[PDB]
Amino acid sequence: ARGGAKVVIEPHRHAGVYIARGKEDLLVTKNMAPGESVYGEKRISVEEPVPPTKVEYRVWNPFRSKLAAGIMGGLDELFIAPGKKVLYLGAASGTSVSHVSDVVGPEGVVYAVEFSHRPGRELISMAKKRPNIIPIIEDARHPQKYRMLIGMVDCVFADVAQPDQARIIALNSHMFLKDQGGVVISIKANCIDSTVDAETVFAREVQKLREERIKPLEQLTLEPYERDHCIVVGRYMRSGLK
Amino acid sequence: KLVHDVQKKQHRERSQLTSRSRYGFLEKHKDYVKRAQDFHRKQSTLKVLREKAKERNPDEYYHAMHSRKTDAKGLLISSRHGDEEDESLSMDQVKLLK
Amino acid sequence: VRKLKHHEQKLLKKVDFLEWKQDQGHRDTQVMRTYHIQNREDYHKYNRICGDIRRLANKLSLLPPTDPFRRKHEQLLLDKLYAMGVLTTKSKISDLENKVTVSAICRRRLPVIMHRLKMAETIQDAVKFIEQGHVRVGPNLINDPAYLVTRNMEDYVTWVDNSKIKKTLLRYRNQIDDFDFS
Amino acid sequence: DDNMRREVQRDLLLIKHRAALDPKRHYKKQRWEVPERFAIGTIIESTILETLMGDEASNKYFKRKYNEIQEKSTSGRKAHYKKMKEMRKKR
Amino acid sequence: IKDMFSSAMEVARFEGAQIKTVSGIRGEIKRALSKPEGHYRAAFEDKILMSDIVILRSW
Amino acid sequence: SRVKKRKKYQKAQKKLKSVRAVYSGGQSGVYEGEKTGIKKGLTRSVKFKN
Amino acid sequence: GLKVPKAVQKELPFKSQIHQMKPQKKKTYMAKRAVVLGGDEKKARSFIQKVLTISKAKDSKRKEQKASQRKERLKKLAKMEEEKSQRDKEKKKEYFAQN
Amino acid sequence: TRKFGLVKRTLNTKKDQRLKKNQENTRNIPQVSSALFFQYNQAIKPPYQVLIDTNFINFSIQKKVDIVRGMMDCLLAKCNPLITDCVMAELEKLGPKYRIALKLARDPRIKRLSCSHKGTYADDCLVHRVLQHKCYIVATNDAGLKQRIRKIPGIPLMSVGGHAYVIEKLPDVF
Numbered sequence A: 001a002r003g004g005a006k007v008v009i010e011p012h013r014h015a016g017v018y019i020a021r022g023k024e025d026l027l028v029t030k031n032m033a034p035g036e037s038v039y040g041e042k043r044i045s046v047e048e049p050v051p052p053t054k055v056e057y058r059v060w061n062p063f064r065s066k067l068a069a070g071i072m073g074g075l076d077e078l079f080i081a082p083g084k085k086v087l088y089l090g091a092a093s094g095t096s097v098s099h100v101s102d103v104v105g106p107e108g109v110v111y112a113v114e115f116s117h118r119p120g121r122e123l124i125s126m127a128k129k130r131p132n133i134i135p136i137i138e139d140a141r142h143p144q145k146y147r148m149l150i151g152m153v154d155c156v157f158a159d160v161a162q163p164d165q166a167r168i169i170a171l172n173s174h175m176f177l178k179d180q181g182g183v184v185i186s187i188k189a190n191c192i193d194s195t196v197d198a199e200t201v202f203a204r205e206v207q208k209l210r211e212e213r214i215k216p217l218e219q220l221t222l223e224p225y226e227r228d229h230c231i232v233v234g235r236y237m238r239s240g241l242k
Numbered sequence B: 001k002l003v004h005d006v007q008k009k010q011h012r013e014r015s016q017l018t019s020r021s022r023y024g025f026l027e028k029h030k031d032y033v034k035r036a037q038d039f040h041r042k043q044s045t046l047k048v049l050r051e052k053a054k055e056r057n058p059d060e061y062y063h064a065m066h067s068r069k070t071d072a073k074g075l076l077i078s079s080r081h082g083d084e085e086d087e088s089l090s091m092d093q094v095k096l097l098k
Numbered sequence C: 001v002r003k004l005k006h007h008e009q010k011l012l013k014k015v016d017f018l019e020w021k022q023d024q025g026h027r028d029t030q031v032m033r034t035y036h037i038q039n040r041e042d043y044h045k046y047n048r049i050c051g052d053i054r055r056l057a058n059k060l061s062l063l064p065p066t067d068p069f070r071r072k073h074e075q076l077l078l079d080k081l082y083a084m085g086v087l088t089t090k091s092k093i094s095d096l097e098n099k100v101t102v103s104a105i106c107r108r109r110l111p112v113i114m115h116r117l118k119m120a121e122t123i124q125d126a127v128k129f130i131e132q133g134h135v136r137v138g139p140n141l142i143n144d145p146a147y148l149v150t151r152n153m154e155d156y157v158t159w160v161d162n163s164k165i166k167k168t169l170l171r172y173r174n175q176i177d178d179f180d181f182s
Numbered sequence D: 001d002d003n004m005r006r007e008v009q010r011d012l013l014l015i016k017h018r019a020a021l022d023p024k025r026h027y028k029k030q031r032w033e034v035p036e037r038f039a040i041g042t043i044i045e046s047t048i049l050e051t052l053m054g055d056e057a058s059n060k061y062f063k064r065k066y067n068e069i070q071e072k073s074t075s076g077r078k079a080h081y082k083k084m085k086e087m088r089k090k091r
Numbered sequence E: 001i002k003d004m005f006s007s008a009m010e011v012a013r014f015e016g017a018q019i020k021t022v023s024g025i026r027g028e029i030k031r032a033l034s035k036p037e038g039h040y041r042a043a044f045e046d047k048i049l050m051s052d053i054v055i056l057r058s059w
Numbered sequence F: 001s002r003v004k005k006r007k008k009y010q011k012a013q014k015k016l017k018s019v020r021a022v023y024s025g026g027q028s029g030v031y032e033g034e035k036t037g038i039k040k041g042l043t044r045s046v047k048f049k050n
Numbered sequence G: 001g002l003k004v005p006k007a008v009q010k011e012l013p014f015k016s017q018i019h020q021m022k023p024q025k026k027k028t029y030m031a032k033r034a035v036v037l038g039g040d041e042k043k044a045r046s047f048i049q050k051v052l053t054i055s056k057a058k059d060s061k062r063k064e065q066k067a068s069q070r071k072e073r074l075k076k077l078a079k080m081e082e083e084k085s086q087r088d089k090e091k092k093k094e095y096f097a098q099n
Numbered sequence H: 001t002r003k004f005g006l007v008k009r010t011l012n013t014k015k016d017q018r019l020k021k022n023q024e025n026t027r028n029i030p031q032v033s034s035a036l037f038f039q040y041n042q043a044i045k046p047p048y049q050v051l052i053d054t055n056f057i058n059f060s061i062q063k064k065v066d067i068v069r070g071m072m073d074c075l076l077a078k079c080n081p082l083i084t085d086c087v088m089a090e091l092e093k094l095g096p097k098y099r100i101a102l103k104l105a106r107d108p109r110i111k112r113l114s115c116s117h118k119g120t121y122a123d124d125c126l127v128h129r130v131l132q133h134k135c136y137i138v139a140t141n142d143a144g145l146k147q148r149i150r151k152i153p154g155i156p157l158m159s160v161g162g163h164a165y166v167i168e169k170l171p172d173v174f
């Protein structure tokens, strides 16, 4: 865990994700724009053969990103992929969306969506080194406003902490999401309902998703990293939900 | 169940006569039972192995009777280097290796 | 043909080109492979005999049990069907209908016996040595692969003398003797 | 490739058996077969075999823990066989 | 087995006796060995060691 | 008895770290990843059966 | 180890002849040729043989630890099997006492 | 130079792919819930959300208790009882001589929550809504369902007996 030690990189079971099997293990995705770490996390470099070109790998901090623990807790099918489009919601900064850009690679795009201007201003300046990120600074509750800017995305990601979280995904899953392409909700128990319990909200937000024709495949809890969350990988059936 | 802690006390084991210390380590019962198992684990894999001598059927032909050879005493020889490729260096290989 | 669809399926619930009830599970092929027998009609040339055992077993079961004909007559027959060696044991009288199978009579074949006596390595390779002419029964060498061998005659199969395959065996034990011209 | 193998082969063999490198770590139980594709690299902000033996605390640990297994594997075998034949013969 | 019985006549008062050892194997003592005065042949059930100490129970 | 209640719960809180991976603290250090290691094939995730 | 008598070892069938490599005495050219890197590599070849000794024995002790608790667990398991055996006999009297 | 041991080429059955029967040719360990203790289930606090069988309704009528008013007597706290969509599909399927139960099932204080199944069978609709969350509190009186849930840790089962209802795996009985 220092700047000296040399680490073996190995491809994860999920595509586009890489494991840094050292004396301890690390979660790692290949930096599309080398030479810069976007929030100061410690990054790995290798060389690949003309002299060998430099390929830089960036660590994927679990405690920063709610997506990050679900990989490192173990999901069967993460619908984000190195070719697929992916819609992102609530990317305050490049804490996690710069990671999701690097795992979809230079082919696929990622649509960063967040309402606030000052975190959105930082999201602009990062989006001009990563060509995949096209950032949208409209509110996520009103998807008809940015309807011109996004077309047929393959998996949405949901990091909103607004308590109307099921309705803010249904209006983004019906209108933008390509059918049969998954939905990765990230439910936070405190920000939806503080009165009722942690587990009730998980049983309430799944049943709200099943009203919107999303059959949720699996549910992870991501407990050792973050306290009291869930990420629920859905699939947008729309047709044969049974 | 219904037994004191003194009734389950201990019974230690005694040692070799110190006059007889030349023939070291008196064997108790549980050191004989390691000896008579692994003699019967030798005869039972030897009486079997002698049973195959009685029934050799000396018309048997397996096709690997060309790579194996046999010493003149009668038991076969297998090479130290083992592989098919580490046999013996050719003169062109020695001319390079020197 | 096509891996026909679900609505194609229900109209064609019964059609199949490869597997028929007439064809009877392809049992005849399935045991032709396990014993490697040359011509196809060889199976049903045995399975006519192996059926004819059971038809004599059946009518000899329809005689009353305390009949000194019937008690004499199948024990007369199990003497022969054990000497020929198609059936493993002589004790059971109902081996004669249950254990008399073609795969029982098709493993007193010569190449199976050369694989049982560990002569050749596999069972195809024994057919390869019979057809080339390396094996013999007593005086005369045998050349049909499909030679039935009596359990009594099962003693006498050897490699044919001065052969190039009985010469190689004796070189492995370093025990050739060319006064025999082995 | 089959070049640069030795500083790589020592490194991967020190990761397949990484449970033994420090008696306080105790990783998860996994097998770690050598993968088909990999790329050894360093951490930007001395290979791990060269890194580890430069330590003194680990290098004093293995010399103790190797002599302490090899005090056990020797114990019955043939030095103990010759000593028992020695004391019968000596007097 | 040596130095359990003093004379070759003393063994003959005791032959057929169910001798046992420390190791737990049984046996019997059969004939008084002659040419030394004390010893005797005894058939056990398995190969006795040299390191082993035979004991004959008595009352 | 108030010690055996204490030394049971303090003993039965070690087991809770071994059955599941209970939350602890947060991340107060500097380091990012995991010490014990990653597995590729675990998938410790409750799958919604039909 | 067991040492087969050679008169048994000679008339064995070909499938089972025991492979016993004789030791080599006349020094091979290759064993007079090959280079052994000394000095720094010796400190990094002693060490790998010193790590793999530890990880083989740490496995074969913990693997023995399971089969020690395997033996204890099946004794506890068969005791639960015996109670479900005898009490299942008692129900099928108290059932058929009605019948 | 023709090969030896030639045989008529014929159809493999154990190996060929054109046959119908031969056409056919990541572990998963579900985490025990972050709510759950050893058996205590430290998350469930009032109000509760309770699933209901067909059988719990039928023996509720014979024992003269309200659902909502009668559950609060056993449970002592507020509860929101909710019949799933599979269970209502059973109550209709029971037919004419159970229709007074079907009236009492559709009551606007009795909630309904849908499910995504291909079936009517609610005995296994219900356990599957229980393993995946463990916030619910099953109200059954089926014999086989009780045995199906008493093996599940930390799920308060609830049955009807005599006068009022009874709970089993609640630690907070009173």
Ligand SMILES: [Zn+2]
Binding pocket: H084, H085, H086, H114, H115, H116, H117, H122, H125
């Ligand atoms: Zn249902």
